[PDB]
């Protein structure tokens, strides 16, 4: 299920999306995030993404809506894996993850990053391969 440490972690994850700290994620904020991860959703796509997680229909995502979403195919996971595996070599390194997190406006110690890698890593080689990435999601 769901620990207070995880709720804490999802609460800081939400802050990566909620750029202005006003407590909601707007279509504009989501667009910014998505472009920082190399994507280019239209205005209507961003509204679609918002409206799917927007439980109360108010046009923005609050933390309870975000947390709910987080409580919970081939191509989407592969597509996401390629966002992190910047050099295409099949392995997410700590430095590739560092880079992704810095693009999202998040300066992390080399230790924090290594724990993220460590938690996803299954075989212990210090990197995240595609099969390990698939498992993390599921």
């Amino acid at each position: 299920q769901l620990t207070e440490e995880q709720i804490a972690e999802f609460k800081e994850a939400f802050s990566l999306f909620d750029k202005d700290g006003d407590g909601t994620i707007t279509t504009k904020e989501l667009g910014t995030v998505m472009r920082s991860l190399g994507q280019n959703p239209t205005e209507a796509e961003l509204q679609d993404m918002i409206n799917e997680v927007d439980a109360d229909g108010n046009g923005t995502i609050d933390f309870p809506e975000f947390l709910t979403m987080m409580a919970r195919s081939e191509e989407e996971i592969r597509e996401a894996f390629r966002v992190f595996d910047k050099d295409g070599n099949g392995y997410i390194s700590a430095a590739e993850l560092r880079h992704v997190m810095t693009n999202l406006g998040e300066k992390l110690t080399d230790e924090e990053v290594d724990e993220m890698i460590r938690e996803a890593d299954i075989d212990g080689d210090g990197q995240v391969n595609y099969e390990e990435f698939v498992q993390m999601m599921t």
Partner: peptide, 22 residues
């Protein structure tokens, strides 16, 4: 950190791809 951040970014990416048009 751990999987929650990693998963959060990953799940939003999934959203992108599951929601595209033409």
């Amino acid at each position: 950190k751990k999987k929650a951040t990693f998963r959060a970014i990953t799940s939003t990416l999934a959203s992108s791809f599951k929601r595209r048009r033409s």
